[PDB]
Amino acid sequence: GAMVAKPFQRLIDLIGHMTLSDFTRFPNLKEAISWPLGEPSLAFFDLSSTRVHRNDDIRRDQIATLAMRSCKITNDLEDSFVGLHRMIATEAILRGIDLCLLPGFDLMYEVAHVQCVRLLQAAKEDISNAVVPNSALIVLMEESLMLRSSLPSMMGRNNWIPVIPP
Protein backbone atom coordinates (compact mmCIF):
# COMPACT_ATOMS: atom_id res chain seq x y z
CA GLY A 1 0.00 0.00 0.00
CA ALA A 2 1.27 3.48 0.63
CA MET A 3 3.69 4.51 3.22
CA VAL A 4 2.61 6.99 5.93
CA ALA A 5 5.56 9.27 5.16
CA LYS A 6 8.96 9.38 3.43
CA PRO A 7 10.87 11.71 5.74
CA PHE A 8 14.22 11.50 4.01
CA GLN A 9 13.07 11.94 0.38
CA ARG A 10 14.77 15.35 -0.04
CA LEU A 11 18.09 14.17 1.40
CA ILE A 12 17.89 11.06 -0.76
CA ASP A 13 17.40 13.21 -3.83
CA LEU A 14 20.48 15.32 -2.96
CA ILE A 15 22.59 12.16 -2.29
CA GLY A 16 21.45 10.52 -5.56
CA HIS A 17 23.39 13.06 -7.52
CA MET A 18 26.58 12.71 -5.58
CA THR A 19 29.38 10.25 -6.17
CA LEU A 20 30.77 7.39 -4.13
CA SER A 21 34.07 9.17 -3.42
CA ASP A 22 32.25 12.10 -1.81
CA PHE A 23 31.49 9.58 1.04
CA THR A 24 34.37 7.05 0.97
CA ARG A 25 36.99 9.71 1.75
CA PHE A 26 35.59 9.97 5.35
CA PRO A 27 35.95 6.84 7.53
CA ASN A 28 32.69 6.96 9.42
CA LEU A 29 30.63 8.07 6.41
CA LYS A 30 32.19 5.22 4.37
CA GLU A 31 31.06 2.70 6.98
CA ALA A 32 27.59 4.28 7.05
CA ILE A 33 26.90 3.41 3.39
CA SER A 34 28.67 0.01 3.58
CA TRP A 35 25.47 -1.48 5.07
CA PRO A 36 23.67 -3.39 3.75
CA LEU A 37 25.99 -4.76 1.03
CA GLY A 38 29.30 -5.07 2.80
CA GLU A 39 30.73 -2.39 0.54
CA PRO A 40 30.06 1.36 0.15
CA SER A 41 27.10 1.94 -2.23
CA LEU A 42 24.73 4.66 -3.35
CA ALA A 43 22.58 2.25 -5.35
CA PHE A 44 19.60 2.45 -2.96
CA PHE A 45 19.66 6.26 -3.20
CA ASP A 46 19.72 6.03 -6.96
CA LEU A 47 16.67 3.80 -7.08
CA SER A 48 14.80 5.95 -4.51
CA SER A 49 15.53 9.46 -5.85
CA THR A 50 12.81 11.38 -7.60
CA ARG A 51 15.49 13.13 -9.72
CA VAL A 52 17.17 10.04 -11.26
CA HIS A 53 16.22 9.06 -14.81
CA ARG A 54 15.87 5.30 -14.67
CA ASN A 55 14.17 2.76 -16.86
CA ASP A 56 11.26 0.84 -15.28
CA ASP A 57 11.81 -2.34 -17.24
CA ILE A 58 15.17 -2.97 -15.47
CA ARG A 59 14.24 -1.52 -12.07
CA ARG A 60 12.72 -4.83 -11.01
CA ASP A 61 15.94 -6.78 -11.82
CA GLN A 62 18.17 -4.29 -10.08
CA ILE A 63 16.01 -4.43 -6.94
CA ALA A 64 16.08 -8.24 -6.96
CA THR A 65 19.86 -8.26 -7.32
CA LEU A 66 20.31 -5.81 -4.44
CA ALA A 67 18.01 -7.78 -2.17
CA MET A 68 19.82 -11.09 -2.97
CA ARG A 69 23.24 -9.57 -2.34
CA SER A 70 22.08 -7.95 0.93
CA CYS A 71 20.56 -11.00 2.68
CA LYS A 72 22.27 -13.78 0.65
CA ILE A 73 19.11 -15.60 -0.31
CA THR A 74 19.27 -16.26 -4.04
CA ASN A 75 17.02 -19.31 -4.47
CA ASP A 76 13.63 -17.59 -4.09
CA LEU A 77 12.94 -14.01 -4.97
CA GLU A 78 10.14 -13.52 -2.48
CA ASP A 79 12.33 -15.00 0.34
CA SER A 80 14.97 -12.47 -0.56
CA PHE A 81 12.59 -9.56 -0.13
CA VAL A 82 11.53 -10.91 3.23
CA GLY A 83 15.26 -11.31 3.96
CA LEU A 84 15.99 -7.70 3.06
CA HIS A 85 13.02 -6.43 5.02
CA ARG A 86 14.45 -8.32 8.02
CA MET A 87 17.83 -6.60 7.58
CA ILE A 88 16.09 -3.22 7.46
CA ALA A 89 14.19 -3.90 10.67
CA THR A 90 17.25 -5.28 12.48
CA GLU A 91 19.33 -2.21 11.68
CA ALA A 92 16.41 0.17 12.36
CA ILE A 93 15.92 -1.35 15.82
CA LEU A 94 19.59 -0.76 16.63
CA ARG A 95 19.40 2.75 15.23
CA GLY A 96 16.22 3.63 17.20
CA ILE A 97 14.23 4.19 14.02
CA ASP A 98 10.43 3.87 14.34
CA LEU A 99 9.33 0.65 12.63
CA CYS A 100 5.95 2.26 11.72
CA LEU A 101 7.96 4.12 9.05
CA LEU A 102 9.20 0.88 7.48
CA PRO A 103 6.30 -1.43 6.47
CA GLY A 104 8.20 -3.01 3.62
CA PHE A 105 6.21 -1.62 0.67
CA ASP A 106 9.20 0.25 -0.86
CA LEU A 107 12.33 -1.55 0.19
CA MET A 108 14.70 0.70 -1.78
CA TYR A 109 13.39 3.76 0.04
CA GLU A 110 13.64 1.94 3.37
CA VAL A 111 17.27 1.01 2.96
CA ALA A 112 18.10 4.59 1.88
CA HIS A 113 16.21 5.93 4.94
CA VAL A 114 18.21 3.72 7.30
CA GLN A 115 21.43 4.69 5.47
CA CYS A 116 20.52 8.38 5.94
CA VAL A 117 20.18 7.82 9.71
CA ARG A 118 23.54 6.02 9.74
CA LEU A 119 25.08 8.90 7.78
CA LEU A 120 23.74 11.57 10.08
CA GLN A 121 25.04 9.81 13.17
CA ALA A 122 28.37 8.97 11.47
CA ALA A 123 28.95 12.58 10.36
CA LYS A 124 29.27 13.73 13.95
CA GLU A 125 32.26 11.51 14.50
CA ASP A 126 34.01 12.51 11.29
CA ILE A 127 33.38 16.18 12.15
CA SER A 128 34.81 15.80 15.62
CA ASN A 129 37.99 14.34 13.90
CA ALA A 130 38.06 17.64 11.91
CA VAL A 131 37.76 16.14 8.42
CA VAL A 132 37.74 18.61 5.48
CA PRO A 133 34.09 19.32 4.62
CA ASN A 134 32.84 18.66 1.16
CA SER A 135 29.30 19.23 -0.04
CA ALA A 136 28.16 15.79 1.08
CA LEU A 137 29.20 16.55 4.64
CA ILE A 138 27.63 20.01 4.55
CA VAL A 139 24.29 18.58 3.36
CA LEU A 140 24.31 16.15 6.26
CA MET A 141 25.13 18.95 8.70
CA GLU A 142 22.26 21.03 7.42
CA GLU A 143 19.68 18.19 7.56
CA SER A 144 20.76 17.52 11.21
CA LEU A 145 20.37 21.11 12.12
CA MET A 146 16.86 21.18 10.66
CA LEU A 147 15.93 17.94 12.50
CA ARG A 148 17.35 19.00 15.87
CA SER A 149 14.84 21.76 15.73
CA SER A 150 11.87 20.00 13.91
CA LEU A 151 11.87 16.40 15.04
CA PRO A 152 15.10 15.14 16.75
CA SER A 153 13.74 11.57 17.07
CA MET A 154 13.97 11.23 13.25
CA MET A 155 17.77 10.91 13.73
CA GLY A 156 17.51 7.90 16.03
CA ARG A 157 19.87 6.98 18.84
CA ASN A 158 23.15 8.68 19.35
CA ASN A 159 24.97 5.33 19.54
CA TRP A 160 27.27 5.33 16.51
CA ILE A 161 30.49 3.35 17.27
CA PRO A 162 33.50 5.24 15.83
CA VAL A 163 35.49 3.36 13.17
CA ILE A 164 39.09 2.57 14.29
CA PRO A 165 41.96 3.61 11.91
CA PRO A 166 44.02 0.85 10.26
Numbering used by the authors: 79 to 244
The publication says:
A truncated stable, soluble core domain spanning residues 83–248 of RVFV NSs (NSs-ΔNΔC) was identified using NMR spectroscopy. The crystals were found to be extremely fragile, and diffracted synchrotron X-rays to 2.2 Å resolution. The structure was successfully phased from the anomalous sulfur signal in a single native crystal and refined to high quality. The NSs-ΔNΔC monomer, molecular mass 19,029 Da, measures approximately 30 × 30 × 50 Å. It is composed of eight α-helices with helices α1-α6 and α8 arranged around a long central helix α7. Two NSs-ΔNΔC monomers constitute the asymmetric unit, with an interface formed by their α8 helices. We therefore conclude the NSs-ΔNΔC structure represents a novel fold. In the crystal lattice NSs-ΔNΔC molecules were found to pack into a highly organized network of two fibril-like assemblies, referred to here as F1 and F2, creating large solvent channels. The T1 interface perpendicular to the F1 fibril axis is defined by an extensive network of hydrogen bonds and salt bridges between the basic face of α1 (Lys84, Gln87, Arg88) and the acidic face of α8 (Glu220, Glu221, Ser228), leading to a large buried interface area of 4 × 852 Å2. Therefore, we conclude that the F1 crystal fibril is not only more stable than F2, but that it also represents the architecture of NSs in intranuclear filaments.
